């Protein structure tokens, strides 16, 4: 048969490659609009930053010849598909300025997504870019070659912050302007995003939240951006404020657009027309924790979908049930990562939930280069199914979020979580993995064992520092009694007042809280996270 | 309530601690036969190897002795007190402390006596220089014999303890030999195809290894070990790492039930025959969850999980420990080796009909710096399509993929649901499709029959189709070289007569070669799953 696919990225070409494997004499035409094809855009930041030496490192082991000689896939570069005709099973295209028509039996719509442009003045001014194409990344390189030293990023998304770091590695002053309460809003709660935020500031990236941008001042077509009513010079601006899926070829063909604005498909990835599969960044998908439909615009999602499309055109049955939003990005020295549902979207899903956060050693506390990762876990009440997890930190958080991610897709309970046999040795984890121990911490709050509160809760009431050595401390109703000294002292403690137990990262806070309870104290609050989030 | 606990292993003191947090009034007494309470054994190798400066560190928080457990948890820890007999009718425990004999009254009793090292019945096994890494005493015995100038060593056992000892001892710039009776290093964890990698990294790091050899005698004056083939290996230190025995003897002497393994039997609640007697840690029988088999999982993580549930039910709860999956990990030099779930040998002895697949893949996006290629092996059950075991070895982050796959195995995931698993991907952390997702797809490619793959084990007429660019490789004998990007065209070269075995660097471009020829109708085309990596 002949298959025509509209794309050129992860989705398009993986779909193409799998159909080639299943059928060796199907006719596969991939229609692409740009010069480059199969480019590893999921790296462009690390190219700007210098980790990657040249852009062709993100297409390697890859021109049209590669796809011809290897897979016998005919890829037409710099050709636009301008209309789909489902009645004649045709795709009209433009090439060399002379139009033509491709006839298909199966068709892949894999058109990706474009950067959403905030409707504001000066957006098209020179020096305002997006990190969507090789070309735009390079332009950032030429303006730094030409004397650019100040940068504004709009948006603390993972693309935003990675272009923040990429740009600071160019020795530019970076300021990031975020619309929301905290940095990385899709992935994190305030509670946690504080950390990331302060790490950025500590690396010379300035970060301002809960502000829009009003205008982009341009001189001779340059820049400076008006925050709240402030100005932030800028020789470049990268706009990273979300995406908008390239679905209009699909809508103008009668294909069904779901409430995200993106092409609706089913589990099989077929679109409304049976002959017409679509997948990747242009397509809607289901959040399997809540079942709401969303756009999960990631590269792993794209390969997974594009393969299921490939398999189906070839006659098989394969499903892509949905996603859970497990994302991860890398900041200077911190990792941040998210799985399942966070507090805002757990709220908008109507789920009754409870929250617990417990940081833990990376590897054996005594082994060299052990770090403290900070995990927050969101558990659904009654069922006790775990519905979200998030992590930020200095050392190895990615593994904990991968395990908690597959735990959440398993619908595991904090009960069956706590006894998950994990791979432990002193260089890899402590005896009970951070994921284990926060399972236990969830059940100590659930079982009402301890009553627990976060750090935003500032009401300054007595705070007890069950610590022991102050090099970093808080100023003050601060009474200090070492945990080891507590069984004995305990006299200072007053009672009849709210005492909020506070240790270094909350372990000893727990072990005190229960000590006080035995004592007879009525109000004891343990500070989740501990001095881990005090800053 | 007063609760007694035999031994301050991990299990013993986590059990006691969990009780303490839920009951401030209970009397908790812990009896310990040795001087040191709560030492972290899992770190003694890295102590000997020098990563950890002081033995005492393995007992720190940022020294956690009886005064610690008294001042902080109001737990009465009795050091150097041996528990000699338990009597369930009397509900008492006889202790000998100070060469005097007393008794301990109890309402609930916890047995957490751990395991002693199994000692192979050999002549000279009690000579000087022969050690186990079971206690801080034996560990610093090693360090002092090196201080006195020992340079030759022999390890018996390619288990994790033995292997960690090989690296620790070689870090002292000694010449280290490992002798293991079975055909492969790390038998309980790995298969031969995988186990050879670990082996070869050991020899390329200068710890020499002899497999499929027994130890027959130890000579002395002060050591030297004669090995099978009567090969004699000089020795100035030997560590025996041959396995363990659960310290369950007071239990059967008290009439409690001993399981088929020799360890104390426990139910899911971690109780024994006597309900007043809970038992956990290295002395207890456990369930392997994929096969239902009864086993001994003498690991520190299972010890603490049990210890917590034990403490939870003494203190009026409902704790459950269903078993384990035998997910273990060790580090040898620049390599990491890990297993979860069932292994080939244990799968056939469990009688399950399964298939296997091997597919190495990059640590991170190939263009990102410090990408390594981990090797994953996946054992998937027939009919169900459940993933029942995985092994991974390599330089790079393998541990992540075995933690995720171990989770999938305990959740009963099939390769079909494994392929869709939403993981955390960004160029510095994984490639677009994580190695786990890729092996899932390669498995569904075996099950779907799209490729016939065979392992690193070939003397039959056949042409080895080599797709690669630079040959720096198999050398020869029926090898035809055609790089993959020219293969589409150059075909009347590959004789459409003989069985073809496509071999590439990692196994990936081979799959696209094998399918290319499938289109060409070659029929008798098979593939080397694993790639060039599994080769000598
Ligand atoms: C800077 C950056 C960093 C990223 N980092 C990550 C990350 O860390 N992790 C992650 O998971 N994801 C990341 N992504 C996202 C990832 O790139 C996308 O999810 C993935 O590229 C999806 O590709 P796709 O095939 O859906 O669309 P694309 O890869 O965008 O492919 C679009 C192609 O379609 C072609 N096209 C579109 N419409 C037409 C038409 N009408 N006619 C002809 N051709 C057309 C265009 O030529 C374009 O070549 C990142 C993206 C960017 C930009
Ligand atoms: C060198 C080494 C490295 C290891 N590495 C790892 C690893 O990397 N990963 C991993 O998962 N596991 C590892 N382990 C295993 C881990 O130590 C065990 O799983 C764990 O120690 C078992 O806990 P336990 O308390 O049951 O045993 P133990 O901690 O040994 O507790 C036994 C205690 O009971 C006391 N006792 C015993 N009998 C009596 C008696 N009759 N009277 C009084 N007291 C008694 C003994 O004094 C001892 O103090 C390692 C073990 C060793 C030795
Ligand atoms: C690679 C790309 C062109 C598709 O090419 P592909 O041939 O389909 O993908 P691979 O190179 O890994 O080979 C894929 C197949 O070989 C298989 N394979 C077989 N043995 C294997 C082995 N030992 N190891 C790895 N893969 C193996 C894989 O399972 C996969 O199987 P499948 O055909 O059933 O799907 C596409 O992913 C792309 O466009 N990448 C650039 C866009 C992108 O992802 N950007 C993100 C930037 S980080
Ligand atoms: C340390 C030991 C005695 C257990 O004592 P413990 O006080 O109960 O263990 P911890 O120090 O971790 O404190 C654990 C408690 O703090 C809880 N906790 C509460 N909030 C926490 C937080 N924010 N972070 C960490 N722990 C927290 C833990 O869940 C746990 O409570 P719980 O199990 O009752 O539900 C035992 O593990 C041991 O002997 N370790 C050495 C033996 C060993 O592990 N050897 C292997 C060498 S690596
Ligand atoms: Ca994802
Ligand atoms: Ca384990």
Residue numbers in the entry:
A (entry chain C): 1 to 61, 67 to 232, 234 to 466, 473 to 488, 493 to 551
B (entry chain D): 1 to 62, 66 to 224, 227 to 463, 470 to 483, 488 to 551
The authors write:
NADH-dependent persulfide reductase (Npsr) has been proposed to facilitate dissimilatory sulfur respiration by reducing persulfide or sulfane sulfur-containing substrates to H2S. The major structural difference between CoADR and Npsr is the addition of a ~100-amino acid rhodanese-like domain to the C-terminus of the Npsr. A surface-accessible cysteine in this domain serves as the initial sulfur-accepting site before a molecule of CoA bound to the FAD-containing domain chaperones the sulfur to the active site cysteine adjacent to FAD.
The 3.1 Å X-ray structure of AfNpsr reveals access to the tightly bound catalytic CoA, and the active site Cys 42 is restricted by a flexible loop (residues 60-66) that is not seen in the bacterial homologs from Shewanella loihica PV-4 and Bacillus anthracis. As expected, the enzyme is a dimer, with the N-terminal FAD-binding domain (residues 1-448) having nearly identical topology to related Npsr and CoADR proteins. On all four AfNpsr subunits found in the asymmetric unit, two loops on the rhodanese domain comprising residues 465-472 and 483-488 were missing due to disorder. In AfNpsr, CoA is deeply buried, and in this configuration of the protein, CoA has little access to the solvent except for a small opening above the pantothenic acid arm. In AfNpsr, the seemingly low accessibility of CoA from the surface of the protein results from a larger loop consisting of residues 60-66 (TTYGAVR) that closes over the CoA binding pocket. It should be noted that for the dimer with the ordered loop, the average B-factor for the loop is 67 Å2 compared to 47 Å2 for the rest of the FAD-binding domain, suggesting there is some flexibility for the opening and closing of the loop over the enzyme-bound CoA. For NADP+, the phosphorylated 2′ hydroxyl group of ribose introduces steric clashes with E183, M184, and M185 as well as strong electrostatic repulsions with E183. A metal ion binding site is located 5.2 Å from FAD. Given that AfNpsr has all of the same catalytic components as the other Npsr and CoADR homologs and that none of these have any demonstrated metal dependence, it is likely that the bound metal ion in AfNpsr plays a structural role.
